[PDB]
Amino acid sequence: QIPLCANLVPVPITNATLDQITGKWFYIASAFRNEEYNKSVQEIQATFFYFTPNKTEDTIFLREYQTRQDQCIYNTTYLNVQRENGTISRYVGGQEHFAHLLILRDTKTYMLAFDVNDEKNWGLSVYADKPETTKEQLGEFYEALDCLRIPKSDVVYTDWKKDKCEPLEKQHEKE
Ligand SMILES: CC(=O)OC[C@H](O)CO
Ligand SMILES: [Cl-]
């Protein structure tokens, strides 16, 4: 009687999948079951970032340009990859958290499903290769939320008009 979620089926990460995610992405939206997670995420006004996989070490080097309180905060870190599980992981508050990487029909968008920990904390984020998207580009994201029974009204979106990091990224590139 519990309908299952075809867009959330894990898919093993290969060297080809690591090439597919190499490059620049924009953070578009998330929604979590935990309300404090939604409110925490609400302070992030925009974020774009670059991934550079290291296939030997099963890591990905992340350079992130986040706008928070109307300024740019730049940070680098390493994510771990669990190839056979289809997950990538990041240390959050000193604990490793895992997410399934789900590359969408259109390889221009992908989602991270945070469905590896306690069920009361599950959530979904979606990313694209441009800062703006259409409702249609987000079809798989909204279907998955419906299937996870997270209402659309809990989604937190970034607002690209608020970005402050394009000026920095531009200088990082001139150098
Ligand atoms: C795995 C995880 O918690 O996050 C991946 C990263 O935050 C998105 O760029
Ligand atoms: Cl689904």
The CA distance from 112 to 98, in Å, is 9
Tell me how far the alpha carbon of residue 139 lies from the centroid of ligand 2, in angstroms: 10
Beta-strand runs (E) in 8-151: 23-32, 44-54, 59-68, 71-82, 87-92, 95-103, 109-114, 123-128
At residue 156, what is the residue type? V
Phi, psi of 158 (to 5 degrees): -75, 155
Domain ranges, ordered by start, for the chain: 2-175
Please check whether residue 110 is in contact with residue 138, taking contact to mean a CB–CB distance below 8 angstroms: no
Q: Which residues pair with 97 in a beta bridge?
A: 90
The CA distance from 138 to 128, in Å, is 10
Q: Is 112 in the pocket of ligand 1 (CB under 6 A)?
A: yes
Helix (H) / strand (E) containing 157: strand 156-157
Q: Is 89 in the pocket of ligand 1 (CB under 6 A)?
A: yes
The CA distance from 32 to 122, in Å, is 6
Q: Choose which residue among 24, 66, 88, 126 to substitute to test ligand 1 binding: the one with the highest number of ligand atoms within 8 A of its C-beta.
A: 88
Q: Is 57 helix (H, G, I), strand (E, B) or coil?
A: coil
For domain 2-175, the CATH superfamily is Calycin beta-barrel core domain (2.40.128.20)
Residue 75's nearest CA partner among 94, 56, 96, 48 is: 48
Q: Is 49 in the pocket of ligand 1 (CB under 6 A)?
A: yes
Protein residue closest via CA to atom 1 of ligand 1: 89
Experimental method: X-ray
CB atoms within 10 A of CB 100: 21
Q: How far is CA 3 from the centre of its chain?
A: 24
The CA distance from 89 to 98, in Å, is 4
CA 146 to each of CA 7, 8, 86, 110: distance values in angstroms, whole numbers, following the listed order: 11, 12, 22, 17
The CA distance from 120 to 138, in Å, is 24
Please check whether residue 158 is in contact with residue 29, taking contact to mean a CB–CB distance below 8 angstroms: yes
